[PDB]
Write a protein that binds this ligand. Structure first.
Ligand SMILES: CC(=O)N[C@H]1[C@H](O[C@@H]2[C@H](O)[C@@H](O)[C@H](O[C@H]3[C@H](O)[C@@H](O)[C@H](O)O[C@@H]3CO)O[C@@H]2CO)O[C@H](CO)[C@H](O)[C@@H]1O[C@@H]1O[C@H](CO)[C@H](O)[C@H](O[C@]2(C(=O)O)C[C@H](O)[C@@H](NC(C)=O)[C@H]([C@H](O)[C@H](O)CO)O2)[C@H]1O
Length: 409
């Protein structure tokens, strides 16, 4: 552990777990998420600040010493022309025109190094808002920036190297003893970010260190929604099939003689010059219902035994099948909840992206929920074929409505 700053939530506050015990000053307008307290929200106000004061012994002052930062960030969709050409600082460690900072702009994360003769290098991660389905817009990203003073500054996103710039021509970098987390210079009063697990390291992290940090901070026994938030019970979700992302779930008819299937194409949402995406708030909603989960919270965990409700014309039905139908593929139906009887409905949730393993009432696997083409109709099925087998039809995302995406529901 070469971490010299590691910030985490404790008791309505933030603490440094490092042996260097940074002082952390939090403003009056900083917010912790209700479900995951480590998710910090900063808004576009002067009091929405976190100031981290490093011990003098670890302040960065060197031409030669290698160093890295890591953090998680969730950046809501840019929906206004005032967001074009508005670079704003979010993480400042600049003192007397030397140091480092993280800034944002439309579709960008920017790393800046500035030496004590005001030579700069910027490394920029650009993501497009003109894409069908974005890996990045309003989705948690794991950011890692590494700096080797002889070679390159590198940006990783979700543990993968995205780009790099040579930095060997920079001289002495003397950063601040203060790290200010604050939206600085943002003209849009509605901009916010969410951030967690800010770390500093006194080396250039290697690819394995970065992959292990990614995995270790990911809460791997908790299932995630599309946005990367914790998956929850009693929260309506629009479904995305990762094999066929340009389709959405629909119900042909309710009852044991009906079926669910993937219908295409998705519509689009756009604002000229700002974004052009596939519509996410489409199709049959799924609601994850408590079965074997405990009373302690609404978080869906790996191996939780659940029921799945499906919403059809503002009424809830139960996802179920008759496992005794001929063939490995068990066509799924939307049943009246009272009328399920002895039909298979228990689902084991698995966290890989989200999988749903349908069970019979004896505790035996019926198989992962996916789809099967019956001529041109992609019917939802449970099939032990999936279980026996990178991207299959049994891989799903759950998309709840979110403030940061802004499409009409
Ligand atoms: C290709 C296929 O049909 N796979 C079936 C599998 O079929 C067996 C053989 O492999 C077939 O070649 C053979 O076809 C016969 C026809 O039935 C007959 O009418 C024709 O005239 O002659 C052929 C005889 O050679 O049939 C045999 C057995 O009958 O059988 C298994 C179960 O044993 C599955 O049904 C399998 O289809 C797969 O089913 C799963 C769910 O169980 C799933 O739907 C798979 O579909 C995806 C996926 O969800 O991951 C999604 C895509 O639709 C699919 N691509 C296609 C079909 O274009 C992909 C890929 O197939 C690949 O698996 C991953 O990319 O998978 C589905 O393939």
């Amino acid at each position: 552990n070469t971490s010299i700053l590691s910030i985490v939530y404790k008791k309505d506050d933030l603490i440094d777990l490092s042996r260097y015990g940074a002082k952390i000053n939090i403003g009056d307008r900083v917010y912790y998420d209700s479900i995951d307290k480590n998710q910090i929200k900063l808004i576009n106000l002067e009091s929405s600040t976190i100031e981290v004061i490093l011990k003098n012994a670890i302040v960065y002052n060197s031409m030669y010493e290698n160093f890295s930062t890591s953090f998680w960030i969730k950046i809501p969709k840019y929906f206004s022309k005032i967001n074009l050409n508005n670079e704003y600082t979010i993480i400042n460690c600049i003192e007397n025109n030397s140091g480092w900072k993280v800034s944002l702009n439309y579709g960008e994360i920017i790393w800046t190094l500035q030496d004590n003769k005001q030579n700069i290098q910027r490394v920029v991660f650009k993501y497009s808002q003109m894409v069908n389905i974005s890996d990045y817009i309003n989705r948690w990203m794991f950011v890692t920036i590494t700096n080797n003073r002889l070679t390159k500054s590198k940006i990783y996103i979700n543990g993968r190297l995205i780009d790099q710039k040579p930095i060997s021509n920079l001289g002495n970098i003397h950063a601040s003893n203060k790290i200010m987390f604050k939206l600085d210079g943002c003209r849009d009063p509605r901009r916010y970010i969410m951030i967690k697990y800010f770390n500093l390291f006194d080396k250039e992290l290697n690819e394995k260190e970065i992959k292990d940090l990614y995995d270790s901070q990911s809460n791997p026994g908790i299932l995630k929604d599309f946005w990367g938030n914790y998956l929850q019970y009693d929260k309506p979700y629009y479904m995305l099939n990762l094999f066929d992302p340009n389709k959405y779930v629909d119900v042909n008819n309710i009852g044991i003689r009906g079926y669910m299937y993937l219908k295409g194409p998705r519509g689009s949402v756009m604002t000229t010059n700002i974004y052009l995406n596939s519509t996410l708030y489409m199709g049959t909603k799924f609601i994850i219902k408590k079965y074997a989960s405990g009373n302690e919270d609404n978080i869906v965990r790996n191996n939780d035994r659940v029921y799945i409700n499906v919403v059809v014309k503002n009424k809830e039905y139960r996802l179920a099948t008759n496992a005794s139908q001929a063939g490995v593929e068990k066509i799924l139906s939307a049943l009246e909840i009272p009328d399920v009887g002895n039909l298979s409905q228990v689902v084991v949730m698995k966290s890989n992206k989200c999988k749903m393993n349908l069970q019979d009432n004896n505790g035996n696997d019926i198989g992962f929920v996916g789809f099967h083409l019956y001529d041109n109709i992609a019917k939802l099925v449970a099939s032990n074929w999936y279980n026996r087998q990178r991207t299959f039809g049994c891989s799903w995302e759950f998309i709840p409505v979110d403030d940061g995406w802004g499409e009409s529901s």
